[PDB]
Amino acid sequence: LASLNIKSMQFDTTGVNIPIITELVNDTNVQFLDQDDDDDPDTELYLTQPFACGTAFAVSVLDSLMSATYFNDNILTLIRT
Amino acid sequence: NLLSIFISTWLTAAGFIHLVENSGDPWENFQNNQALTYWECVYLLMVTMSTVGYGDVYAKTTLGRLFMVFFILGGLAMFASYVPEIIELIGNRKKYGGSYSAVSGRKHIVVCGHITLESVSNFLKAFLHKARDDVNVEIVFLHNISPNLELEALFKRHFTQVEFYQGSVLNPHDLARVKIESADACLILANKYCADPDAEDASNIMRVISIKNYHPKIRIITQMLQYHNKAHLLNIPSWNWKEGDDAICLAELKLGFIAQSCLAQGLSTMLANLFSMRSFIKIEEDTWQKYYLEGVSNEMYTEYLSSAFVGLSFPTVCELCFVKLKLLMISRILINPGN
Amino acid sequence: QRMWWAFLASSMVTFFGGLFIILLWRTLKYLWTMTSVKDWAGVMISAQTLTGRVLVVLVFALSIGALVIYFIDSSNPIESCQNFYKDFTLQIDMAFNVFFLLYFGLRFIAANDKLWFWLEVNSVVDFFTVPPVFVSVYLNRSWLGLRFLRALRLIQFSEILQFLNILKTSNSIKLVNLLSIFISTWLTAAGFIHLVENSGDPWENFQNNQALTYWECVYLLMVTMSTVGYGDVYAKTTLGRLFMVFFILGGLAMFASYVPEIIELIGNRKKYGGSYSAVSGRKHIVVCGHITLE
Ligand SMILES: [Ca+2]
Ligand SMILES: [Ca+2]
């Protein structure tokens, strides 16, 4: 709701260009963040427009980090740096 | 898997019993041979495992009888073990899972939200009213709960207009199924008799958010139980209320009726009778009911003023616009036109 | 000789020709490879209009009459060459089936999608029973055949009880719907088994025919589906045994699928719905409020 509140700002200008990043506990809800996107439930989170534009971020994207750091621990340290 | 395993057991038992019967038991020098065909043995297996036990075809050999006993026991045990899977598999049936067809030259609307028997019944009574002109707009419904039997009977009574579909409003597939894009407007009902009305208001907010996400240019009529929730609803980028995105807030409207009747007694009842489309009924016995029914027969209508009444003469016409037209009417808005 | 070829071929080729004709709406016009009258029929086949309400009652009455005529003919031999104008039975059934034919045509004109309309069980019965009776006078002989399928029309009875105000309890309407379905499937299965057994399988040159009356066959099916299996009567022909096995499977499957209905109907008996009758001279006191055991 607030993201949509920010997108509907009006000062003099419009608030659509304002940078917004939103945490989501459910990756499905990303469809409501933007209106130009083609709402395809089959499409995974990474292919969604808000995620591709760097305006949405869930924690499911960090689930593969377990496998990534199992196959190579060093990369995790890189993130820690 | 269950069908294949049942068929395999059936055929294997039929073959084994056919082999046993067509070759008599060795204890009597193979003198118990019975002319039984394989398909007759299949028929015997069916008539002995459905428990029908016709007794027309029987297993005469001792080995045949022994295996018949043991494998009746085993087959009944296996069927009893498979009962839970049969029970759980059958229960999953779909009541009205389908899609809506767009009839050319026909308008239609879709209703979502809190759907119950009483709410739907009241909505149909208010919508499909005989006194109002012929209502030709198809009515489509949608809910996450399968319709009840009496709901299906009611929809059968209104088979011409009303037709149910099953789905979730938040799912774009369901919205595309009932052709949300082609509908004139979408109606969202709210559970006024629900615990914690804030949760219901927020739920309706999500419903309208999803509908606007699918199709920004759709007319939305929704019910809000608070005013701060209405202000929240105003914040949606596509929530343009200028041309018909009306949000009927029951709480503030009802309290306003109460306050207006406080200002002038009996105002709420006259407003409610005016807005409600009531079929006028005339009774003969001389009571106040006759006059009350005559007073509530009046309804509400709107129309844009004509050329003769539009040239800098709105209130002056409003002085005597009524005796010759037998009606009553009230820049931005028309409220008590004066001088 | 026998003449079942005419009736069977008529019915099957009617089905196939209809399926092919309707199926070519997109197959032929694969990217180029009125309504006012049409939906008018839709307001007649439906129950909204007064003529529509009358129509279904006539449908049920004619179906019942046809079933009675089928029983009467089943009391007679399987086939016989007879003049149409002699007896009084060969024309009343024609009236029944031509009324059903015009009802079918009214549905067909109003059919929204004729492809799915062609796969409707009522229409299946209609054009499985009408071509045989049409050709039964083009050859002037009788053939019981699939004339028992009319019994499948008993499933509409409950809907007709929607209009007659005899029954007003929804649960009782569901109960009568279940009873009608059970009776219809029972009678149709009895007709099928009677037809199959009264004339032996063709590959045996009709030499193993078993003399079974229709009511005896009804008793046979009732015994079979109660899982009693007396063995007094049974299917001797190979086709009889095969269909007996198939319909045992089908009947047990349908009964299993109907267990929740039996559960939700039987047991939901209301406690009290009547009114206390006042005994003259004897008073009474009404105790209400917190009514618990203690
Ligand atoms: Ca979207
Ligand atoms: Ca009126």
Side-chain angles (χ1 to χ4, degrees), chain B residues 61-285:
Chain B
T61 72
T62 309
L63 276 296
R65 283 158 173 178
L66 191 52
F67 182 76
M68 272 305 327
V69 159
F70 274 140
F71 177 75
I72 296 169
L73 184 42
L76 291 203
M78 179 206 84
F79 158 76
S81 66
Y82 279 169
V83 175
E85 281 143 4
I86 293 181
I87 292 298
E88 62 156 30
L89 191 141
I90 292 300
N92 309 338
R93 313 302 300 119
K94 278 79 180 176
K95 287 313 279 155
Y96 268 123
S99 180
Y100 170 68
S101 176
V103 191
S104 305
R106 188 71 58 184
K107 317 181 57 171
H108 83 110
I109 64 169
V110 59
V111 179
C112 61
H114 174 73
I115 288 301
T116 47
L117 183 63
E118 60 89 20
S119 311
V120 161
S121 309
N122 305 353
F123 171 72
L124 274 296
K125 294 156 210 154
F127 204 87
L128 301 187
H129 204 257
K130 277 74 69 177
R132 186 185 301 105
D133 192 288
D134 196 24
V135 185
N136 50 5
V137 285
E138 302 289 324
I139 317 171
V140 187
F141 282 82
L142 191 146
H143 203 268
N144 209 3
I145 294 297
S146 68
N148 209 0
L149 287 202
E150 70 280 353
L151 209 73
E152 181 216 0
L154 173 59
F155 283 16
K156 206 57 65 190
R157 301 170 231 165
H158 309 309
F159 182 76
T160 44
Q161 300 95 0
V162 192
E163 64 184 1
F164 193 93
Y165 291 111
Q166 183 76 351
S168 181
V169 54
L170 308 159
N171 177 22
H173 288 322
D174 299 332
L175 305 188
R177 272 173 33 178
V178 305
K179 314 303 174 290
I180 192 66
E181 61 86 20
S182 65
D184 190 275
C186 181
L187 311 190
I188 314 187
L189 295 173
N191 197 1
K192 62 188 76 66
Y193 302 129
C194 83
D196 215 17
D198 198 75
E200 179 59 82
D201 291 331
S203 175
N204 290 119
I205 285 178
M206 280 285 168
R207 271 81 160 270
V208 62
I209 285 169
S210 70
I211 301 299
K212 301 312 283 192
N213 188 18
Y214 187 104
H215 197 72
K217 61 181 291 294
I218 187 66
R219 268 206 62 202
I220 299 301
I221 296 89
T222 185
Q223 309 190 355
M224 201 68 47
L225 269 69
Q226 305 290 344
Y227 210 58
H228 39 75
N229 295 135
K230 195 174 180 300
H232 283 6
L233 182 60
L234 299 177
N235 264 3
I236 302 301
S238 182
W239 182 247
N240 62 72
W241 63 90
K242 308 311 294 169
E243 69 267 27
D245 284 25
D246 293 298
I248 295 90
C249 180
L250 261 50
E252 67 94 17
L253 265 188
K254 97 183 180 67
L255 292 191
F257 288 168
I258 293 315
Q260 292 305 304
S261 294
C262 177
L263 274 169
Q265 180 87 40
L267 185 42
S268 62
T269 186
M270 75 167 313
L271 282 159
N273 280 311
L274 193 51
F275 276 9
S276 44
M277 181 45 158
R278 299 325 297 157
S279 60
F280 165 55
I281 301 294
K282 172 61 72 69
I283 62 170
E284 309 86 3
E285 303 82 17

Side-chain angles (χ1 to χ4, degrees), chain B residues 6-7 10 39-40 42-44 46-47 50-57 86-87 90 106 149-150 153 157 159-160, chain C residues 39 46 48 170 174 220 223-225 227-231 233-235 241-242 244-246 248-249 252 256-257 264:
Chain B
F6 162 77
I7 290 283
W10 180 8
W39 310 107
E40 272 175 35
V42 167
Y43 169 78
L44 163 65
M46 294 299 291
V47 307
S50 54
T51 70
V52 177
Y54 267 127
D56 45 10
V57 171
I86 293 181
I87 292 298
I90 292 300
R106 188 71 58 184
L149 287 202
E150 70 280 353
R157 301 170 231 165
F159 182 76
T160 44
Chain C
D39 63 0
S46 179
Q48 188 254 348
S170 163
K174 182 65 179 179
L220 177 61
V223 163
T224 303
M225 301 286 157
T227 74
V228 165
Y230 273 120
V233 291
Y234 45 89
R241 296 194 203 264
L242 183 63
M244 199 35 79
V245 163
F246 286 163
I248 291 170
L249 260 190
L252 277 296
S257 61
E264 71 198 288

Side-chain angles (χ1 to χ4, degrees), chain C residues 13-39:
Chain C
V13 309
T14 314
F15 194 111
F16 299 155
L19 188 85
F20 264 90
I21 282 169
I22 304 308
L23 203 52
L24 287 187
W25 294 137
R26 186 190 177 186
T27 318
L28 177 67
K29 309 305 295 176
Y30 206 100
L31 297 170
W32 199 61
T33 288
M34 295 298 102
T35 298
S36 159
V37 55
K38 162 188 162 191
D39 63 0

Side-chain angles (χ1 to χ4, degrees), chain A residues 30-39, chain B residues 213-214:
Chain A
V30 71
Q31 51 186 356
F32 310 141
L33 273 168
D34 186 74
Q35 68 276 9
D36 303 337
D37 48 346
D38 186 74
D39 282 310
Chain B
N213 188 18
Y214 187 104

Side-chain angles (χ1 to χ4, degrees), chain C residues 160-227:
Chain C
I160 297 168
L161 212 45
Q162 282 316 136
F163 312 134
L164 303 178
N165 285 352
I166 308 183
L167 193 39
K168 294 172 213 190
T169 309
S170 163
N171 298 110
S172 290
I173 298 194
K174 182 65 179 179
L175 188 153
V176 76
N177 180 29
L178 284 174
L179 191 62
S180 66
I181 279 184
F182 182 76
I183 290 295
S184 84
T185 187
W186 179 10
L187 272 296
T188 61
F192 195 97
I193 279 289
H194 170 272
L195 183 63
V196 166
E197 274 294 328
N198 280 38
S199 50
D201 45 349
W203 58 78
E204 278 299 325
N205 305 350
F206 300 75
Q207 287 305 315
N208 54 354
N209 48 343
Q210 177 177 7
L212 302 180
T213 79
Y214 183 74
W215 306 103
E216 214 163 6
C217 171
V218 176
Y219 164 81
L220 177 61
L221 276 296
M222 181 36 48
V223 163
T224 303
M225 301 286 157
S226 63
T227 74

